Amino acid sequence: ARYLGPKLKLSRREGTDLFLKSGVRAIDTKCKIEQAPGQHGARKPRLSDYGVQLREKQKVRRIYGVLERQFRNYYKEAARLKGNTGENLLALLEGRLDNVVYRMGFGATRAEARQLVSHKAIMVNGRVVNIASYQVSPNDVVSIREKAKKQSRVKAALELAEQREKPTWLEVDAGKMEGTFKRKPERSDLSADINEHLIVELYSK
Amino acid sequence: KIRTLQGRVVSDKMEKSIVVAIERFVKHPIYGKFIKRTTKLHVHDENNECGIGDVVEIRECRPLSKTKSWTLVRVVEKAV
Amino acid sequence: ANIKSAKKRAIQSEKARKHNASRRSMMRTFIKKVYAAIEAGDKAAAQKAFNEMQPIVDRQAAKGLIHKNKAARHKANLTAQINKLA
Amino acid sequence: MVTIRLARHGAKKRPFYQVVVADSRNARNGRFIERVGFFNPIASEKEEGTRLDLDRIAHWVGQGATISDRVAALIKEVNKAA
RNA sequence: AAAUUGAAGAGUUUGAUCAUGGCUCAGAUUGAACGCUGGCGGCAGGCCUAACACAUGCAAGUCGAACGGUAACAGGAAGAAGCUUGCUUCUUUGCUGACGAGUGGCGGACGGGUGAGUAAUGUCUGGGAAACUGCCUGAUGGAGGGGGAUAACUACUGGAAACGGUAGCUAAUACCGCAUAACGUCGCAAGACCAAAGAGGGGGACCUUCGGGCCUCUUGCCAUCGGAUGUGCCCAGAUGGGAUUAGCUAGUAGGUGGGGUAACGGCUCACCUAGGCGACGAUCCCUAGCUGGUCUGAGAGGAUGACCAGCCACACUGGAACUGAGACACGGUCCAGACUCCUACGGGAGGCAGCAGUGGGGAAUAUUGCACAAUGGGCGCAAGCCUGAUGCAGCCAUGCCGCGUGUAUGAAGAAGGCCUUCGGGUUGUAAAGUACUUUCAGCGGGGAGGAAGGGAGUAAAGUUAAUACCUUUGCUCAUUGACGUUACCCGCAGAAGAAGCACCGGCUAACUCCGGCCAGCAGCCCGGUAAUACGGAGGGUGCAAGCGUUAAUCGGAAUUACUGGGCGUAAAGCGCACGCAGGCGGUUUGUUAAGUCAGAUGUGAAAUCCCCGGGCUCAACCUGGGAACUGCAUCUGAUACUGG
């Protein structure tokens, strides 16, 4: 129910950085990003339509660390909700608890953010929530527990996040080690190199 | 004011009873065509007033025999 | 029977069967008397048998042996049959 | 006779009773005549867990319907709170 | 406010093309099975086949406030003491707390199981009249006075047993008359007729024949008319296939009369009439429980009817009735049959398609568990007893959902493995090393909620002649949990206990090396000596506590085309015509309002589906409200079109 193997292999296969490493270096200094994994990585074959759709879906999944059953249920709920299916899907993906904890700055990677959440080190409205897929609603307050504020993991993650960009829908205080989920991000707030319509066409065929 | 039916008498050979055929116009449940459907009822005809072909008005009552549960109200058109 | 209540119910049921059989045979005899008086055409004997039959029929209908509807049926039938003679 | 009782719906270890008017011979969760409320015994006191209509309940009690002991206690507490 | 916002193609006939046409695939889904593998939890599901046969335990009892009672244990008791005189230990007493057996009342027709039969004696929808209805409930009345028995018991006695027989005794709210008798039954009427039962709590005095009568309250009893509920009955429409089944029917169709039922009725009988059903499929044959619903589909449809809920049928096979308000009765009765068992050989006993379980069949489906603590049920004034319903637990990855099997750093990129143009590349930050963390599992400590009640006390009110008893209402006290070591929380230790399956020629994401049309693969179109198709290795791809294969349904399949196809040559115009039933029908006026349309009412069970919220740490799941249930009937109108 988790991917534990090599991380940079996924970003090499997707041809794009998936932020699977903290950021102490550039990925170019740790692996051949422009080369696909394996013995036959130098070749690049012409992808089919199904190939491109599958590769975009896998890129999104590996970005958010979501397996196929949960992602299929996410698409089902997004197609159930009113509006455009793609932005609904991306909003449902961004609402996760481990995703927010990573974006909040308490995790260097979404894997260590998921470890922080699962290990009962993250609180939501004063209630310790240890579900990574926990849907965070607007106005929710996310904070590190008193016992886990002493970890150097959170400090390094805070620093690494300060060297990153700041999301518009997160009001975080690094001193109190707490943040607020103000609102769900609109389509224009997430990455622009993610084609949601490819996933919609892949799941609607 | 009482709920009733209307049909034509197709048989009066029995005594005190007639067989009235209630024809109805029903749309076919699949192909949408309006088809004719016939409902033949054993009706109690006391006084033997109805002949073959009369357009009669009948109503439902208690069972009067093994197959008769409807009774006559009046005759509208009389076999001509 | 396997249950104790089933055995006691069987005993009580056969006892009540015998009691009800005696009562029903009495009532049937007293009604057959009226029917035979009807057959004979004797209206005085018919009314006498009807007057003897009515109370026990009402009593067995009240004691739960037969229904009040059955008692009323017997009374009405025999009355209408007596009135067809005199 | 006709009785007003609870039908234990809900999940395992989290019961949810529906106050139903039913003929006392049917099963608990079986055939009933009319549902006149509900009762959530594990309510968080933040929400409502007692919404049993007293109008139809009184109408049925006026027709000889019997009230079970739990429904009688529920009616008493609903009258006291309201 | 929301609650139809919904529709994808590909491979394969040919040297090639277009069309036709079938086969196959990509999607969902399952009561699944098998193979490899397998950490935890929540919620659900779990004999689809042999309605095959069943060992064993339990699944329906309850009331002493109906009754005679006392056999058992607990007490009171009068009288006799071992005697270590305050332990008193046995002789007799229903005196009472209770209670075995027995009569009696209620319940065993509910609850639970299965889908054999049933193609309409059923189910669904919508109507109806000729009916009954225990317990619950409203109103009005009555509740008087007697008798004969009988179980238990006693004595004798027959049987291996099962179970009886005879004689005597006793009780009742058991049974039977009498009186009474109407807004009840019969009858137009006069009149005639029909019922009952007590028990319990307490008590001021008056009167007691020392049991108590007398007062009050509760409860029970009988009669009638209603309510509610349940059930019985009738009609219309709908509800599989076959014409290689076209005629069927003698109680058959109807009528009069007798009987019968709670009730209408050929329900039954006598007689009379000669009918009735059928091409709109009667009759016959095969299959089949029906529905809300479930799966699939854009929809229309197709398939289906496990769990949950309603209805029906069945209870070893066939038949039958008895009791009862209700049965022709799973754990009742009688008979017959098959089978199994006990036997003293004369006779007996039994029916898991109740809960576990066994043998068998099968590819395949679980424990001979805990508790009545909650809900419901039976009985009881109540306490309470019973409850394999039910609440839980055990087993199974069977499904859905959630979480974990670590995280960060980590190179000239170690070793080995594989490939190599022998330069190197890849496995690969992957590992090792370093720093950190401890969800879940393991050990220990705290700890909700499911719990409402019930009991004992007092106080108030009502009732009453009564400041008793009883009912209701406040408060006080001591308690009520199978789950259970609960959920949840806290502490400890250590990466420590936790990743596999399928695939890589195209469809279809994923490529190289090595070993001869053989071995083998294959869902549809490879292998005859450098095979991306066989087998192994490296690498990669997709899923992931699962992964594949098989079986099955729908989709794609517009491939049964109503929505939505065709027939010159691809499958398809009868050889031609006349013509009954049927289908359709020029044009105008009037009328009707059957089709059609509009509005309203009733109904369309709950659950499920969908929408907005709520509670479980999230989800699954549970749940509030709404929408929906596209249908049917009735009533009132419209008159353009179809019909008369």
What is the number of domains present in chain D?
A: 1
Q: Which nucleotide is nearest to A96 (CA to C1')?
A: E618
Q: Quick check: helix, strand or coil at residue B24? A: strand
Residue count (chain C): 86
**Do A203 and A75 touch, CB atoms closer than 8 A?**
yes
Q: Are D74 and D52 in contact (CB under 8 A)?
A: yes
Cα radius of gyration rounded to whole Å, chain D: 12
Question: Beta carbon of A30 within 7 Å of strand E?
Answer: yes
Coil, strand or helix: which one is D36?
Answer: strand
Polymer length in residues for chain D: 82
- Distance of alpha carbon A133 from alpha carbon A74, whole angstroms: 11
Resolution (A): 2.7
Which two structure tokens, joined as six digits, stand for B73?
């109200």
What are the residue boundaries of the structural domains of chain A, listed by start?
7-93+190-203, 94-181
Q: Distance from residue D35 (CA) to nucleotide E614 (C1'), in Å?
A: 20
Is the C-beta of residue D41 closer than 7 Å to nucleic acid chain E? yes
A2 touches strand E (CB under 7 A): yes
- Determine contact, residues D49/D41, Cβ cutoff 8 Å: yes
Q: Which CATH superfamily is domain A94-181 in?
A: RNA-binding S4 domain (3.10.290.10)
First to last CA, chain D: 30
B33 CA → E632 C1’, Å: 20
Q: Please answer whether residues A170 and A181 qualify as being in contact, where contact means their C-beta atoms are separated by less than 8 angstroms.
A: yes
Of A78, A55, A58, give the one whose Cα is nearest residue A67. A58
Helices and strands: H and E segment counts in chain D = 2, 4
The DSSP 8-state label assigned to residue D38 in this structure reads: E
- In sequence order, what DSSP letters do the residues of A80-135 get, joined into one string? HSSS-HHHHHHHHHHTSHHHHHHHHTS-SSHHHHHHHHHTT-EEETTEE---TT--
Superfamily of structural domain A7-93+190-203 = Ribosomal protein S4/S9, N-terminal domain (1.10.1050.10)
Task: Scan for tokens 């009314």, then name that residue.
Answer: C47
CA of B14: nearest nucleotide by C1' is E254
| A163 Cβ nearer than 7 Å to chain E strand | no
Joined together, the tokens standing for residue C54 give 């009515």
Decide: CB of B80 under 7 A of nucleic strand E: no
Q: Which chains touch D (3 or more CB pairs under 8 A)?
A: none
Q: Domain ranges for chain C, please list them.
A: 2-86
- E147 C1' – C63 CA distance, angstroms? 19
